[PDB]
Amino acid sequence: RVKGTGVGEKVKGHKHERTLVAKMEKRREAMLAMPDLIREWKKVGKRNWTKFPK
Amino acid sequence: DKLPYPKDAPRKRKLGLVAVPRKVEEVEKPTMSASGLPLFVTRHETI
């Protein structure tokens, strides 16, 4: 009946395991927008760009 | 040999390779792992 591995208990998982799916979904979400983001960058220009990360 | 070679003589070059039997690949990659689990699951969205 110990924490996690006992009868009825459920393992919690490490932080990098609980956030694994949300981690890969964020990278997938970004690549899908990569083409449209490069077009805006190659169109607006390297100098007039202002949408920088934070 | 004496350099420079005459401009009209064939290039002198060495093979620089060793002969080995070619490796023919086998298409036998299983779909289920040793633990009886699928090695990959495919999902498709719907619009």
């Binding site: 964020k26 990278r27 979400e29 970004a30 690549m31 990569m34 983001l37 490069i38 960058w41 390297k46 100098r47 760009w49 949408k51 920088f52 990360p53 934070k54 | -």
Partner: protein, 48 residues
């Protein structure tokens, strides 16, 4: 103080980055670089 070291962050949200130097009195850097996590060339933008 005339030069600063900036960090160009991958817009693929992989966490990879490049570091380059550029004067303070210059516009932020933005380049198309190779990301070894996704193994493709993506857009990199300055951190701040």
């Amino acid at each position: 103080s005339r030069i600063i070291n900036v960090r160009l962050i991958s817009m693929a949200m992989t966490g990879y980055f490049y570091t380059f130097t550029r004067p303070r009195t210059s516009l932020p850097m933005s380049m198309l670089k190779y990301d070894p996590i996704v193994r493709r060339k993506v857009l990199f933008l300055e951190q701040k």
